[PDB]
Enzyme design. Structure first.
Site, PDB file in Angstrom:
ATOM      1  N   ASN A 108       0.844  -1.190   0.000  1.00 38.83           N
ATOM      2  CA  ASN A 108       0.000   0.000   0.000  1.00 38.83           C
ATOM      3  C   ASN A 108       0.886   1.249   0.000  1.00 38.83           C
ATOM      4  O   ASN A 108       1.323   1.699   1.055  1.00 38.83           O
ATOM      5  CB  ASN A 108      -0.897  -0.004   1.236  1.00 38.83           C
ATOM      6  CG  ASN A 108      -1.799   1.205   1.306  1.00 38.83           C
ATOM      7  OD1 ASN A 108      -1.755   2.082   0.448  1.00 38.83           O
ATOM      8  ND2 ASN A 108      -2.628   1.257   2.337  1.00 38.83           N
TER       9      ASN A 108
ATOM     10  N   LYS B  54       0.101   4.188  -0.385  1.00 36.20           N
ATOM     11  CA  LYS B  54      -0.598   5.329   0.191  1.00 36.20           C
ATOM     12  C   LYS B  54      -0.437   6.539  -0.704  1.00 36.20           C
ATOM     13  O   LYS B  54      -0.468   6.403  -1.930  1.00 36.20           O
ATOM     14  CB  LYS B  54      -0.064   5.625   1.596  1.00 36.20           C
ATOM     15  CG  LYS B  54      -0.139   4.403   2.502  1.00 36.20           C
ATOM     16  CD  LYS B  54       0.051   4.726   3.970  1.00 36.20           C
ATOM     17  CE  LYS B  54      -0.127   3.449   4.815  1.00 36.20           C
ATOM     18  NZ  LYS B  54       0.054   3.644   6.287  1.00 36.20           N
TER      19      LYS B  54
ATOM     20  N   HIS C 216      -9.696   1.154   5.007  1.00 29.26           N
ATOM     21  CA  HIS C 216      -8.403   1.407   5.644  1.00 29.26           C
ATOM     22  C   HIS C 216      -8.639   2.424   6.770  1.00 29.26           C
ATOM     23  O   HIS C 216      -9.377   3.399   6.598  1.00 29.26           O
ATOM     24  CB  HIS C 216      -7.392   1.951   4.631  1.00 29.26           C
ATOM     25  CG  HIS C 216      -5.990   2.020   5.159  1.00 29.26           C
ATOM     26  ND1 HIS C 216      -5.561   3.014   6.014  1.00 29.26           N
ATOM     27  CD2 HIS C 216      -4.922   1.206   4.964  1.00 29.26           C
ATOM     28  CE1 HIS C 216      -4.290   2.810   6.318  1.00 29.26           C
ATOM     29  NE2 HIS C 216      -3.878   1.721   5.695  1.00 29.26           N
TER      30      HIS C 216
ATOM     31  N   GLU D  14      -7.059   4.875   7.871  1.00 34.02           N
ATOM     32  CA  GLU D  14      -6.789   6.269   7.548  1.00 34.02           C
ATOM     33  C   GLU D  14      -8.005   6.926   6.901  1.00 34.02           C
ATOM     34  O   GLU D  14      -8.184   8.137   6.981  1.00 34.02           O
ATOM     35  CB  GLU D  14      -5.572   6.383   6.630  1.00 34.02           C
ATOM     36  CG  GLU D  14      -4.266   6.153   7.356  1.00 34.02           C
ATOM     37  CD  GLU D  14      -3.109   5.806   6.429  1.00 34.02           C
ATOM     38  OE1 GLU D  14      -3.266   5.877   5.186  1.00 34.02           O
ATOM     39  OE2 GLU D  14      -2.032   5.455   6.951  1.00 34.02           O
TER      40      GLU D  14
ATOM     41  N   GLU E 141      -5.925  -4.401  11.247  1.00 38.51           N
ATOM     42  CA  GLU E 141      -5.059  -3.248  11.459  1.00 38.51           C
ATOM     43  C   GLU E 141      -5.066  -2.800  12.904  1.00 38.51           C
ATOM     44  O   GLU E 141      -5.867  -1.946  13.276  1.00 38.51           O
ATOM     45  CB  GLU E 141      -5.517  -2.058  10.621  1.00 38.51           C
ATOM     46  CG  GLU E 141      -5.277  -2.142   9.137  1.00 38.51           C
ATOM     47  CD  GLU E 141      -5.608  -0.829   8.465  1.00 38.51           C
ATOM     48  OE1 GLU E 141      -6.775  -0.393   8.560  1.00 38.51           O
ATOM     49  OE2 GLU E 141      -4.698  -0.228   7.857  1.00 38.51           O
TER      50      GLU E 141
ATOM     51  N   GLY F 290       1.613   3.956  15.627  1.00 35.73           N
ATOM     52  CA  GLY F 290       1.775   5.325  16.097  1.00 35.73           C
ATOM     53  C   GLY F 290       1.304   5.684  17.498  1.00 35.73           C
ATOM     54  O   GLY F 290       0.488   6.591  17.672  1.00 35.73           O
TER      55      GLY F 290
ATOM     56  N   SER G 177       2.510  -2.356  11.628  1.00 41.05           N
ATOM     57  CA  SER G 177       3.825  -2.121  11.032  1.00 41.05           C
ATOM     58  C   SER G 177       4.552  -3.414  10.716  1.00 41.05           C
ATOM     59  O   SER G 177       4.764  -4.247  11.595  1.00 41.05           O
ATOM     60  CB  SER G 177       4.703  -1.276  11.948  1.00 41.05           C
ATOM     61  OG  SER G 177       4.252   0.060  11.963  1.00 41.05           O
TER      62      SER G 177
HETATM   63  O1  G2H Z   1       3.183   1.746   9.928  1.00 45.13           O
HETATM   64  P1  G2H Z   1       3.867   1.975   8.552  1.00 45.13           P
HETATM   65  O2  G2H Z   1       5.408   1.918   8.684  1.00 45.13           O
HETATM   66  O3  G2H Z   1       3.384   3.309   7.875  1.00 45.13           O
HETATM   67  O4  G2H Z   1       3.427   0.721   7.536  1.00 45.13           O
HETATM   68  C1  G2H Z   1       2.255  -0.099   7.660  1.00 45.13           C
HETATM   69  C2  G2H Z   1       0.948   0.312   7.688  1.00 45.13           C
HETATM   70  O5  G2H Z   1       0.260   1.217   7.648  1.00 45.13           O
HETATM   71  C3  G2H Z   1       2.673  -1.628   7.760  1.00 45.13           C
HETATM   72  O6  G2H Z   1       2.032  -2.863   7.191  1.00 45.13           O
END
Ligand code: G2H
Ligand code: G2H
Lengths: 246, 246
Positions: free
Chosen positions: A8, A10, A93, A95, A163, A169, A209
Protein backbone atom coordinates in the site's frame (compact mmCIF):
# COMPACT_ATOMS: atom_id res chain seq x y z
CA UNK A 1 -4.15 -21.02 1.76
CA UNK A 2 -2.20 -19.07 -0.85
CA UNK A 3 -0.18 -16.33 0.89
CA UNK A 4 -0.97 -12.70 0.10
CA UNK A 5 1.48 -9.78 0.26
CA UNK A 6 0.16 -6.32 -0.54
CA UNK A 7 2.03 -3.06 -0.97
CA UNK A 8 0.00 0.00 0.00
CA UNK A 9 1.99 2.98 -1.31
CA UNK A 10 -0.60 5.33 0.19
CA UNK A 11 -0.11 8.93 -0.90
CA UNK A 12 3.50 8.79 -2.08
CA UNK A 13 5.54 8.62 -5.23
CA UNK A 14 6.76 10.50 -8.26
CA UNK A 15 6.93 9.23 -11.82
CA UNK A 16 10.65 8.72 -11.33
CA UNK A 17 10.75 7.01 -7.94
CA UNK A 18 8.11 4.56 -9.15
CA UNK A 19 10.14 3.62 -12.22
CA UNK A 20 13.08 2.93 -9.94
CA UNK A 21 11.04 1.06 -7.34
CA UNK A 22 9.24 -1.21 -9.85
CA UNK A 23 12.58 -1.91 -11.48
CA UNK A 24 13.68 -3.46 -8.19
CA UNK A 25 10.42 -5.37 -7.71
CA UNK A 26 10.58 -6.83 -11.23
CA UNK A 27 13.90 -8.46 -10.40
CA UNK A 28 12.47 -10.71 -7.70
CA UNK A 29 11.72 -14.08 -9.30
CA UNK A 30 8.60 -15.77 -7.93
CA UNK A 31 5.69 -17.99 -8.98
CA UNK A 32 2.43 -16.00 -9.05
CA UNK A 33 0.42 -19.22 -9.00
CA UNK A 34 1.88 -19.97 -5.56
CA UNK A 35 1.89 -16.45 -4.11
CA UNK A 36 -0.16 -13.29 -4.42
CA UNK A 37 1.68 -9.98 -4.50
CA UNK A 38 -0.36 -6.84 -5.08
CA UNK A 39 0.72 -3.21 -5.45
CA UNK A 40 -1.67 -0.36 -4.65
CA UNK A 41 -0.47 2.92 -6.15
CA UNK A 42 -2.13 6.32 -6.23
CA UNK A 43 -5.06 6.40 -8.67
CA UNK A 44 -3.33 8.88 -10.99
CA UNK A 45 -0.29 6.58 -10.95
CA UNK A 46 -2.22 3.41 -11.76
CA UNK A 47 -1.56 3.29 -15.51
CA UNK A 48 2.08 4.22 -15.08
CA UNK A 49 2.75 1.60 -12.41
CA UNK A 50 0.79 -1.08 -14.29
CA UNK A 51 2.86 -0.62 -17.46
CA UNK A 52 6.07 -0.97 -15.44
CA UNK A 53 5.19 -3.95 -13.24
CA UNK A 54 5.36 -7.37 -14.90
CA UNK A 55 2.34 -9.67 -15.05
CA UNK A 56 3.47 -11.60 -11.97
CA UNK A 57 2.50 -8.52 -9.96
CA UNK A 58 -1.17 -7.63 -9.48
CA UNK A 59 -2.30 -4.05 -9.06
CA UNK A 60 -5.28 -2.26 -7.57
CA UNK A 61 -6.53 1.04 -6.16
CA UNK A 62 -6.53 2.35 -2.58
CA UNK A 63 -10.22 3.18 -2.52
CA UNK A 64 -13.48 2.63 -4.39
CA UNK A 65 -16.75 4.61 -4.35
CA UNK A 66 -19.95 3.38 -2.66
CA UNK A 67 -22.02 4.89 -5.48
CA UNK A 68 -21.98 3.80 -9.11
CA UNK A 69 -21.45 5.95 -12.19
CA UNK A 70 -23.15 9.32 -11.89
CA UNK A 71 -22.99 12.77 -10.29
CA UNK A 72 -20.27 12.11 -7.73
CA UNK A 73 -17.40 14.50 -8.41
CA UNK A 74 -14.06 13.08 -7.30
CA UNK A 75 -15.18 9.47 -6.91
CA UNK A 76 -14.13 6.38 -8.82
CA UNK A 77 -16.74 3.66 -9.19
CA UNK A 78 -16.39 -0.11 -9.22
CA UNK A 79 -17.72 0.04 -12.79
CA UNK A 80 -15.01 2.45 -13.95
CA UNK A 81 -12.53 0.16 -12.18
CA UNK A 82 -13.85 -3.01 -13.85
CA UNK A 83 -13.66 -1.37 -17.29
CA UNK A 84 -9.96 -0.56 -16.76
CA UNK A 85 -9.42 -4.09 -15.43
CA UNK A 86 -8.19 -2.98 -11.99
CA UNK A 87 -8.13 -6.24 -10.03
CA UNK A 88 -8.12 -5.35 -6.33
CA UNK A 89 -9.31 -2.47 -4.17
CA UNK A 90 -8.64 -1.60 -0.54
CA UNK A 91 -11.72 -0.99 1.59
CA UNK A 92 -12.05 0.50 5.05
CA UNK A 93 -8.40 1.41 5.64
CA UNK A 94 -8.24 3.09 9.05
CA UNK A 95 -6.79 6.27 7.55
CA UNK A 96 -10.03 6.73 5.64
CA UNK A 97 -12.13 5.84 8.68
CA UNK A 98 -10.15 8.42 10.64
CA UNK A 99 -9.72 11.44 8.37
CA UNK A 100 -12.76 10.89 6.19
CA UNK A 101 -15.24 9.38 8.64
CA UNK A 102 -15.87 6.33 6.47
CA UNK A 103 -18.28 4.18 8.47
CA UNK A 104 -18.99 0.45 8.67
CA UNK A 105 -22.01 1.21 6.55
CA UNK A 106 -19.74 2.71 3.88
CA UNK A 107 -17.50 -0.34 4.08
CA UNK A 108 -20.46 -2.66 3.54
CA UNK A 109 -21.77 -0.74 0.52
CA UNK A 110 -18.34 -0.35 -1.02
CA UNK A 111 -17.73 -4.09 -0.65
CA UNK A 112 -21.09 -4.81 -2.25
CA UNK A 113 -20.46 -2.51 -5.19
CA UNK A 114 -17.04 -4.14 -5.62
CA UNK A 115 -18.22 -7.76 -5.58
CA UNK A 116 -21.07 -6.92 -7.94
CA UNK A 117 -18.48 -5.79 -10.48
CA UNK A 118 -16.09 -8.72 -10.09
CA UNK A 119 -13.45 -6.84 -8.14
CA UNK A 120 -11.42 -8.53 -5.43
CA UNK A 121 -11.46 -6.72 -2.10
CA UNK A 122 -8.90 -6.12 0.64
CA UNK A 123 -11.16 -5.22 3.58
CA UNK A 124 -9.67 -3.51 6.64
CA UNK A 125 -10.75 -3.31 10.27
CA UNK A 126 -9.13 -3.02 13.69
CA UNK A 127 -9.49 -1.63 17.22
CA UNK A 128 -8.11 1.62 18.61
CA UNK A 129 -5.66 2.04 21.47
CA UNK A 130 -8.46 3.25 23.72
CA UNK A 131 -10.67 0.26 22.87
CA UNK A 132 -7.80 -2.15 23.47
CA UNK A 133 -7.14 -0.81 26.96
CA UNK A 134 -10.84 -1.25 27.75
CA UNK A 135 -10.37 -4.87 26.63
CA UNK A 136 -12.98 -4.37 23.91
CA UNK A 137 -10.73 -5.69 21.12
CA UNK A 138 -12.82 -8.78 20.33
CA UNK A 139 -16.10 -6.94 20.77
CA UNK A 140 -15.03 -4.26 18.28
CA UNK A 141 -13.60 -6.71 15.75
CA UNK A 142 -16.75 -8.82 15.82
CA UNK A 143 -18.95 -5.79 15.17
CA UNK A 144 -16.85 -4.55 12.25
CA UNK A 145 -16.57 -7.97 10.64
CA UNK A 146 -20.24 -8.81 11.17
CA UNK A 147 -20.94 -5.58 9.28
CA UNK A 148 -20.08 -7.06 5.88
CA UNK A 149 -19.14 -10.73 6.25
CA UNK A 150 -22.58 -11.86 5.11
CA UNK A 151 -21.94 -10.33 1.67
CA UNK A 152 -18.98 -12.63 1.05
CA UNK A 153 -19.82 -15.20 -1.63
CA UNK A 154 -16.45 -16.27 -3.00
CA UNK A 155 -13.88 -16.54 -0.22
CA UNK A 156 -10.91 -16.33 -2.59
CA UNK A 157 -11.91 -12.84 -3.66
CA UNK A 158 -12.14 -11.06 -0.31
CA UNK A 159 -9.02 -10.63 1.80
CA UNK A 160 -9.47 -9.49 5.40
CA UNK A 161 -6.84 -7.31 7.06
CA UNK A 162 -6.46 -6.71 10.78
CA UNK A 163 -5.06 -3.25 11.46
CA UNK A 164 -4.17 -2.94 15.14
CA UNK A 165 -4.55 0.86 15.21
CA UNK A 166 -3.51 0.77 18.86
CA UNK A 167 0.03 -0.26 17.96
CA UNK A 168 0.40 1.98 14.90
CA UNK A 169 1.77 5.33 16.10
CA UNK A 170 1.45 5.26 19.89
CA UNK A 171 4.72 3.72 21.06
CA UNK A 172 3.10 0.28 21.32
CA UNK A 173 4.05 -3.00 19.61
CA UNK A 174 1.90 -5.89 18.38
CA UNK A 175 3.75 -9.14 19.00
CA UNK A 176 3.32 -12.17 16.70
CA UNK A 177 1.42 -13.78 19.58
CA UNK A 178 -1.00 -10.91 20.16
CA UNK A 179 -1.84 -10.74 16.45
CA UNK A 180 -2.16 -14.53 16.16
CA UNK A 181 -4.80 -14.45 18.91
CA UNK A 182 -7.05 -11.95 17.12
CA UNK A 183 -6.41 -13.59 13.73
CA UNK A 184 -7.76 -16.76 15.33
CA UNK A 185 -10.91 -15.06 16.66
CA UNK A 186 -11.62 -13.43 13.31
CA UNK A 187 -11.30 -16.75 11.52
CA UNK A 188 -13.63 -18.21 14.14
CA UNK A 189 -16.20 -15.50 13.49
CA UNK A 190 -16.11 -16.41 9.81
CA UNK A 191 -16.44 -20.12 10.58
CA UNK A 192 -19.45 -19.66 12.85
CA UNK A 193 -21.21 -17.35 10.40
CA UNK A 194 -20.09 -18.72 7.00
CA UNK A 195 -18.97 -22.30 7.57
CA UNK A 196 -15.64 -24.09 7.91
CA UNK A 197 -14.61 -24.68 4.30
CA UNK A 198 -14.92 -20.90 3.98
CA UNK A 199 -13.19 -19.97 7.23
CA UNK A 200 -10.22 -22.16 6.25
CA UNK A 201 -10.17 -20.64 2.78
CA UNK A 202 -10.45 -16.89 3.46
CA UNK A 203 -7.11 -15.15 4.05
CA UNK A 204 -6.51 -12.84 6.99
CA UNK A 205 -3.57 -10.44 6.70
CA UNK A 206 -1.78 -8.50 9.43
CA UNK A 207 -1.81 -4.77 8.75
CA UNK A 208 0.23 -3.26 11.59
CA UNK A 209 3.83 -2.12 11.03
CA UNK A 210 5.65 -4.75 9.01
CA UNK A 211 9.34 -4.61 8.11
CA UNK A 212 12.18 -6.84 6.93
CA UNK A 213 12.96 -7.85 10.50
CA UNK A 214 9.58 -8.84 11.95
CA UNK A 215 7.81 -10.19 8.87
CA UNK A 216 9.08 -13.75 9.33
CA UNK A 217 7.91 -14.21 12.92
CA UNK A 218 4.54 -12.94 11.73
CA UNK A 219 3.95 -14.96 8.56
CA UNK A 220 4.88 -18.01 10.68
CA UNK A 221 1.75 -17.68 12.81
CA UNK A 222 -1.01 -20.16 12.02
CA UNK A 223 -3.79 -17.72 11.20
CA UNK A 224 -1.66 -15.03 9.58
CA UNK A 225 -1.66 -15.37 5.79
CA UNK A 226 0.42 -12.41 4.66
CA UNK A 227 0.33 -8.66 5.09
CA UNK A 228 -0.63 -5.22 3.91
CA UNK A 229 2.71 -3.40 4.01
CA UNK A 230 2.87 0.37 4.34
CA UNK A 231 6.07 2.41 4.40
CA UNK A 232 8.23 -0.68 4.01
CA UNK A 233 6.64 -1.18 0.58
CA UNK A 234 8.17 2.15 -0.50
CA UNK A 235 11.67 0.70 -0.14
CA UNK A 236 13.46 -1.73 -2.43
CA UNK A 237 14.05 -3.94 0.60
CA UNK A 238 10.35 -4.74 0.25
CA UNK A 239 11.39 -7.71 -1.89
CA UNK A 240 12.70 -9.37 1.26
CA UNK A 241 9.30 -9.11 2.91
CA UNK A 242 8.01 -10.99 -0.13
CA UNK A 243 10.72 -13.60 0.16
CA UNK A 244 9.63 -14.16 3.76
CA UNK A 245 6.37 -15.53 2.37
CA UNK A 246 7.82 -17.67 -0.40
CA UNK B 1 -11.20 38.55 -19.07
CA UNK B 2 -10.42 35.38 -20.98
CA UNK B 3 -13.51 33.15 -21.02
CA UNK B 4 -13.34 29.80 -19.25
CA UNK B 5 -15.30 26.65 -20.18
CA UNK B 6 -14.82 23.59 -17.99
CA UNK B 7 -16.05 20.05 -18.53
CA UNK B 8 -16.66 18.13 -15.30
CA UNK B 9 -17.22 14.50 -16.32
CA UNK B 10 -17.78 13.58 -12.67
CA UNK B 11 -17.95 9.82 -12.15
CA UNK B 12 -18.63 8.68 -15.69
CA UNK B 13 -16.87 7.18 -18.66
CA UNK B 14 -15.31 4.07 -20.11
CA UNK B 15 -12.08 3.83 -22.07
CA UNK B 16 -14.22 3.60 -25.20
CA UNK B 17 -16.77 6.38 -24.68
CA UNK B 18 -13.89 8.71 -23.84
CA UNK B 19 -12.03 7.89 -27.05
CA UNK B 20 -15.17 8.73 -28.98
CA UNK B 21 -15.99 11.86 -27.00
CA UNK B 22 -12.46 13.32 -27.28
CA UNK B 23 -12.51 12.60 -30.99
CA UNK B 24 -15.45 15.00 -31.23
CA UNK B 25 -13.88 17.61 -28.97
CA UNK B 26 -10.65 17.52 -30.99
CA UNK B 27 -12.53 18.52 -34.14
CA UNK B 28 -13.59 21.92 -32.81
CA UNK B 29 -11.15 24.54 -34.04
CA UNK B 30 -10.40 27.25 -31.48
CA UNK B 31 -7.59 29.51 -30.29
CA UNK B 32 -6.41 28.48 -26.79
CA UNK B 33 -4.75 31.85 -26.30
CA UNK B 34 -8.20 33.41 -26.51
CA UNK B 35 -10.28 30.83 -24.64
CA UNK B 36 -9.74 28.44 -21.76
CA UNK B 37 -11.31 25.01 -22.19
CA UNK B 38 -10.56 22.45 -19.51
CA UNK B 39 -11.64 18.82 -19.16
CA UNK B 40 -11.87 17.10 -15.78
CA UNK B 41 -11.93 13.29 -16.13
CA UNK B 42 -11.87 10.64 -13.45
CA UNK B 43 -8.41 10.33 -11.83
CA UNK B 44 -7.84 6.82 -13.19
CA UNK B 45 -8.81 8.18 -16.62
CA UNK B 46 -6.45 11.16 -16.52
CA UNK B 47 -3.56 9.72 -18.52
CA UNK B 48 -5.88 8.20 -21.08
CA UNK B 49 -7.84 11.42 -21.61
CA UNK B 50 -4.69 13.56 -21.70
CA UNK B 51 -3.13 11.42 -24.46
CA UNK B 52 -6.29 11.73 -26.57
CA UNK B 53 -7.02 15.43 -26.13
CA UNK B 54 -4.95 17.83 -28.23
CA UNK B 55 -2.81 20.50 -26.56
CA UNK B 56 -5.48 23.17 -27.09
CA UNK B 57 -7.46 21.44 -24.32
CA UNK B 58 -6.28 21.68 -20.71
CA UNK B 59 -6.94 18.88 -18.25
CA UNK B 60 -7.22 18.58 -14.48
CA UNK B 61 -8.57 16.39 -11.68
CA UNK B 62 -11.91 16.57 -9.86
CA UNK B 63 -10.41 16.71 -6.39
CA UNK B 64 -7.15 17.31 -4.53
CA UNK B 65 -6.04 16.34 -1.01
CA UNK B 66 -5.63 18.81 1.86
CA UNK B 67 -2.63 16.85 3.16
CA UNK B 68 0.70 16.47 1.42
CA UNK B 69 2.49 13.20 0.64
CA UNK B 70 2.27 10.66 3.43
CA UNK B 71 0.01 8.16 5.19
CA UNK B 72 -3.27 9.11 3.55
CA UNK B 73 -4.62 6.04 1.76
CA UNK B 74 -6.89 6.97 -1.14
CA UNK B 75 -5.73 10.56 -1.40
CA UNK B 76 -3.93 12.41 -4.17
CA UNK B 77 -1.75 15.32 -3.14
CA UNK B 78 -1.04 18.59 -4.90
CA UNK B 79 2.60 17.48 -4.98
CA UNK B 80 1.82 14.28 -6.85
CA UNK B 81 -0.44 16.31 -9.14
CA UNK B 82 2.33 18.80 -9.86
CA UNK B 83 4.80 16.03 -10.70
CA UNK B 84 2.37 14.68 -13.32
CA UNK B 85 1.95 18.19 -14.70
CA UNK B 86 -1.78 18.20 -13.97
CA UNK B 87 -2.80 21.83 -14.50
CA UNK B 88 -6.17 22.42 -12.80
CA UNK B 89 -8.11 20.97 -9.87
CA UNK B 90 -11.68 21.42 -8.68
CA UNK B 91 -12.15 22.39 -5.04
CA UNK B 92 -15.36 22.43 -3.02
CA UNK B 93 -17.80 20.96 -5.51
CA UNK B 94 -21.16 20.75 -3.75
CA UNK B 95 -21.28 16.99 -4.34
CA UNK B 96 -18.22 16.61 -2.17
CA UNK B 97 -19.59 19.04 0.41
CA UNK B 98 -22.83 17.06 0.46
CA UNK B 99 -21.78 13.41 0.41
CA UNK B 100 -18.34 13.74 1.94
CA UNK B 101 -18.91 16.56 4.41
CA UNK B 102 -16.07 18.65 3.01
CA UNK B 103 -16.10 21.91 4.97
CA UNK B 104 -15.05 25.49 4.20
CA UNK B 105 -11.94 24.74 6.22
CA UNK B 106 -11.13 21.83 3.88
CA UNK B 107 -11.64 24.17 0.94
CA UNK B 108 -9.18 26.74 2.32
CA UNK B 109 -6.55 24.10 3.08
CA UNK B 110 -7.01 22.37 -0.26
CA UNK B 111 -6.69 25.69 -2.07
CA UNK B 112 -3.56 26.53 -0.10
CA UNK B 113 -1.91 23.21 -0.87
CA UNK B 114 -2.83 23.73 -4.53
CA UNK B 115 -1.41 27.24 -4.89
CA UNK B 116 1.77 26.29 -3.05
CA UNK B 117 2.35 23.65 -5.74
CA UNK B 118 1.62 25.87 -8.76
CA UNK B 119 -1.74 24.33 -9.56
CA UNK B 120 -4.62 26.38 -10.90
CA UNK B 121 -7.83 26.02 -8.93
CA UNK B 122 -11.52 25.96 -9.81
CA UNK B 123 -13.17 26.81 -6.48
CA UNK B 124 -16.86 26.05 -5.99
CA UNK B 125 -19.46 27.48 -3.63
CA UNK B 126 -23.21 28.13 -3.61
CA UNK B 127 -26.35 28.35 -1.48
CA UNK B 128 -28.92 25.63 -0.89
CA UNK B 129 -32.61 25.75 -1.71
CA UNK B 130 -33.44 26.20 1.96
CA UNK B 131 -31.02 29.09 2.37
CA UNK B 132 -32.34 30.78 -0.75
CA UNK B 133 -35.90 30.71 0.54
CA UNK B 134 -34.69 32.31 3.76
CA UNK B 135 -33.15 35.02 1.57
CA UNK B 136 -29.70 34.17 2.94
CA UNK B 137 -28.06 33.81 -0.48
CA UNK B 138 -25.69 36.79 -0.20
CA UNK B 139 -24.96 36.00 3.43
CA UNK B 140 -23.99 32.39 2.66
CA UNK B 141 -21.88 33.24 -0.39
CA UNK B 142 -19.99 35.96 1.43
CA UNK B 143 -19.13 33.50 4.18
CA UNK B 144 -17.96 30.78 1.80
CA UNK B 145 -15.91 33.17 -0.30
CA UNK B 146 -14.44 34.96 2.72
CA UNK B 147 -13.22 31.49 3.72
CA UNK B 148 -10.39 31.42 1.17
CA UNK B 149 -10.34 34.64 -0.84
CA UNK B 150 -7.39 36.05 1.13
CA UNK B 151 -5.18 33.16 -0.02
CA UNK B 152 -5.55 34.29 -3.62
CA UNK B 153 -2.27 35.75 -4.88
CA UNK B 154 -2.45 35.42 -8.67
CA UNK B 155 -5.99 36.11 -9.88
CA UNK B 156 -5.48 34.35 -13.19
CA UNK B 157 -4.88 31.03 -11.45
CA UNK B 158 -8.04 30.76 -9.36
CA UNK B 159 -11.41 30.46 -11.06
CA UNK B 160 -14.50 30.92 -8.89
CA UNK B 161 -17.68 28.97 -9.64
CA UNK B 162 -21.13 29.75 -8.32
CA UNK B 163 -23.19 26.59 -7.96
CA UNK B 164 -26.79 27.55 -7.24
CA UNK B 165 -27.59 24.27 -5.47
CA UNK B 166 -31.22 25.34 -5.20
CA UNK B 167 -31.77 25.22 -8.96
CA UNK B 168 -29.95 21.89 -9.27
CA UNK B 169 -32.39 19.06 -8.55
CA UNK B 170 -35.52 20.70 -7.11
CA UNK B 171 -37.54 21.73 -10.16
CA UNK B 172 -36.24 25.29 -9.92
CA UNK B 173 -34.52 27.36 -12.63
CA UNK B 174 -31.78 29.96 -12.31
CA UNK B 175 -32.46 32.68 -14.87
CA UNK B 176 -29.61 34.63 -16.48
CA UNK B 177 -30.76 37.59 -14.41
CA UNK B 178 -30.70 35.81 -11.07
CA UNK B 179 -27.23 34.40 -11.69
CA UNK B 180 -25.93 37.74 -12.99
CA UNK B 181 -26.99 39.37 -9.73
CA UNK B 182 -25.01 36.96 -7.56
CA UNK B 183 -22.02 37.04 -9.90
CA UNK B 184 -22.03 40.81 -9.35
CA UNK B 185 -22.09 40.49 -5.55
CA UNK B 186 -19.30 37.92 -5.63
CA UNK B 187 -17.07 40.11 -7.79
CA UNK B 188 -17.78 43.01 -5.40
CA UNK B 189 -16.73 40.92 -2.42
CA UNK B 190 -13.43 40.36 -4.21
CA UNK B 191 -13.12 44.06 -5.06
CA UNK B 192 -13.62 45.21 -1.48
CA UNK B 193 -11.26 42.60 -0.06
CA UNK B 194 -8.61 42.27 -2.79
CA UNK B 195 -8.87 45.45 -4.86
CA UNK B 196 -10.30 46.40 -8.25
CA UNK B 197 -7.58 45.29 -10.67
CA UNK B 198 -8.03 41.86 -9.09
CA UNK B 199 -11.83 41.81 -8.99
CA UNK B 200 -11.94 42.78 -12.68
CA UNK B 201 -9.37 40.13 -13.54
CA UNK B 202 -10.68 37.00 -11.82
CA UNK B 203 -13.13 34.74 -13.72
CA UNK B 204 -16.41 33.77 -12.06
CA UNK B 205 -18.17 30.85 -13.73
CA UNK B 206 -21.80 29.75 -13.50
CA UNK B 207 -22.19 26.20 -12.22
CA UNK B 208 -25.91 25.44 -12.38
CA UNK B 209 -27.35 23.31 -15.22
CA UNK B 210 -25.89 24.45 -18.53
CA UNK B 211 -26.94 23.12 -21.93
CA UNK B 212 -26.78 24.09 -25.61
CA UNK B 213 -29.94 26.13 -25.30
CA UNK B 214 -29.34 28.34 -22.27
CA UNK B 215 -25.56 28.82 -22.44
CA UNK B 216 -25.69 31.87 -24.73
CA UNK B 217 -28.07 33.92 -22.61
CA UNK B 218 -25.80 33.11 -19.69
CA UNK B 219 -22.37 33.89 -21.14
CA UNK B 220 -23.87 37.22 -22.27
CA UNK B 221 -24.22 38.44 -18.69
CA UNK B 222 -21.66 41.00 -17.59
CA UNK B 223 -20.25 39.16 -14.61
CA UNK B 224 -20.48 35.63 -16.00
CA UNK B 225 -17.18 34.53 -17.52
CA UNK B 226 -17.94 30.98 -18.58
CA UNK B 227 -19.13 27.77 -16.96
CA UNK B 228 -18.46 24.47 -15.27
CA UNK B 229 -20.55 22.06 -17.34
CA UNK B 230 -21.79 18.77 -15.94
CA UNK B 231 -23.85 16.21 -17.86
CA UNK B 232 -23.87 18.34 -20.99
CA UNK B 233 -20.09 17.85 -21.13
CA UNK B 234 -20.66 14.11 -21.61
CA UNK B 235 -22.26 14.75 -25.01
CA UNK B 236 -20.61 15.64 -28.30
CA UNK B 237 -22.96 18.63 -28.48
CA UNK B 238 -20.72 20.08 -25.77
CA UNK B 239 -18.71 21.72 -28.56
CA UNK B 240 -21.63 24.08 -29.13
CA UNK B 241 -21.39 25.25 -25.56
CA UNK B 242 -17.74 26.04 -26.34
CA UNK B 243 -18.74 27.91 -29.50
CA UNK B 244 -21.18 29.94 -27.42
CA UNK B 245 -18.14 31.45 -25.72
CA UNK B 246 -15.94 31.99 -28.76
O1 G2H C 1 3.18 1.75 9.93
P1 G2H C 1 3.87 1.97 8.55
O2 G2H C 1 5.41 1.92 8.68
O3 G2H C 1 3.38 3.31 7.87
O4 G2H C 1 3.43 0.72 7.54
C1 G2H C 1 2.26 -0.10 7.66
C2 G2H C 1 0.95 0.31 7.69
O5 G2H C 1 0.26 1.22 7.65
C3 G2H C 1 2.67 -1.63 7.76
O6 G2H C 1 2.03 -2.86 7.19
O1 G2H D 1 -27.04 19.62 -13.66
P1 G2H D 1 -26.27 18.74 -14.66
O2 G2H D 1 -27.10 18.48 -15.94
O3 G2H D 1 -25.79 17.40 -14.00
O4 G2H D 1 -24.89 19.57 -15.13
C1 G2H D 1 -24.23 20.62 -14.40
C2 G2H D 1 -23.75 20.57 -13.13
O5 G2H D 1 -23.63 19.90 -12.21
C3 G2H D 1 -24.12 21.92 -15.30
O6 G2H D 1 -23.02 22.93 -15.44
Amino acid sequence: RKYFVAANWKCNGTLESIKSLTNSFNNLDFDPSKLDVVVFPVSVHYDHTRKLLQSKFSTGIQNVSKFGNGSYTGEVSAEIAKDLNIEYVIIGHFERRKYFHETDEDVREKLQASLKNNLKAVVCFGESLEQREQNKTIEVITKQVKAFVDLIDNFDNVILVYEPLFAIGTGKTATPEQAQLVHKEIRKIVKDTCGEKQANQIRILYGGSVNTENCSSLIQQEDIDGFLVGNASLKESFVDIIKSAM
